[PDB]
Write a protein that binds this ligand. Structure first.
Ligand SMILES: NCCCCCC(=O)N[C@H]1Cc2ccccc2[C@@H]1Cc1ccc2c(c1C(=O)O)OCO2
Ligand SMILES: NCCCCCC(=O)N[C@H]1Cc2ccccc2[C@@H]1Cc1ccc2c(c1C(=O)O)OCO2
Lengths: 149, 149
């Protein structure tokens, strides 16, 4: 559970926002990309796994699950690549909800930034610091720290 | 101490590698950029502060310390922007040493990747996971977790 992440892809302004969610905490990382390709997804996963202890990734769709470039990155980074089938149906709702929340924050900050990528990183910041009371950022650190001990 | 980061800029293949070091743990994040500008530095800091609780940043040079775009990002993200003068002279040696280590890892992986940015993220991965015994990744989580409690 401390090492399980979920990929999520959403769209805004004719562009693609790729998101990784740490399932146990709700903590996220995200990037703007021109289009979701195996190559973009592979590079993003490499970045994530160098920064947090990523054991398992639930991929966001069958194309990324199939992609040989994505498999190569998961192999390289020691990641178990799994499908993202919501056997638990609440998953879909949680993801949907998070996408709406992120787009809302992006809209709230959009005019403070000339470029979309900046607004998206502002949204990552606000989401991870938001007190719900602990924040997502505090929960991920606590979960992993307990696990290390 | 749990919130103190140091910026570091090094060069390779006619390009610039921008690095942020968590001082207490040795944990890093890094990116390849065409040139070190206020704009690139500001965007990088925003990304970092959305991902880890960045309280203080020791900037890597006077230009980034002076840059209004960098000051705007530090303001936005709640970061105390400080100079990076090594009042403790061991700092210079630690930074120099880390840059050599990173370039060595990059050389060891360089042929596994078509692009430099990929090799640099491979190096971030290897550096943060390297058991020295705890890893840098384990130390940063433990330091911040203790602080939260
Ligand atoms: N000898 C030259 C042959 C190089 C290709 C070999 C090969 O498949 N490497 C994988 C291994 C590996 C492992 C993890 C992540 C990326 C990669 C690389 C692929 C790759 C994918 C996406 C990218 C890339 C590159 C890149 O190749 O940099 O660049 C920016 O987005
Ligand atoms: N639309 C009217 C607003 C005009 C921008 C106002 C303004 O200075 N915002 C700062 C606030 C702020 C706060 C933190 C980080 C960036 C920024 C932004 C600057 C900026 C810097 C670097 C970048 C950027 C942009 C960007 O502007 O996206 O994009 C990629 O690297």
């Amino acid at each position: 559970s401390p090492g399980i992440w979920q990929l999520d892809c959403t769209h805004l302004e004719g562009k693609v926002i790729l998101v990784a969610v740490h399932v146990a905490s709700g903590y996220i990382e995200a990037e703007v990309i021109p289009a979701e390709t195996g190559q973009e997804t592979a590079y993003f996963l490499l970045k994530l796994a160098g920064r947090w202890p990523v054991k398992t990734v639930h991929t966001d769709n069958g194309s990324n699950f199939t992609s040989t470039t994505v498999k190569a990155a998961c192999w390289w980074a020691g990641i178990k690549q799994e499908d993202g089938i919501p056997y638990n149906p609440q998953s879909q709702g949680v993801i949907e909800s998070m996408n709406k929340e992120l787009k809302k924050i992006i809209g709230q900050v959009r005019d403070q930034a000339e470029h979309l990528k900046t607004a998206v990183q502002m949204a990552v910041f606000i989401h991870n610091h938001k007190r719900k009371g602990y924040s997502a950022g505090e929960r991920i650190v606590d979960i992993i720290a307990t696990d290390i001990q």
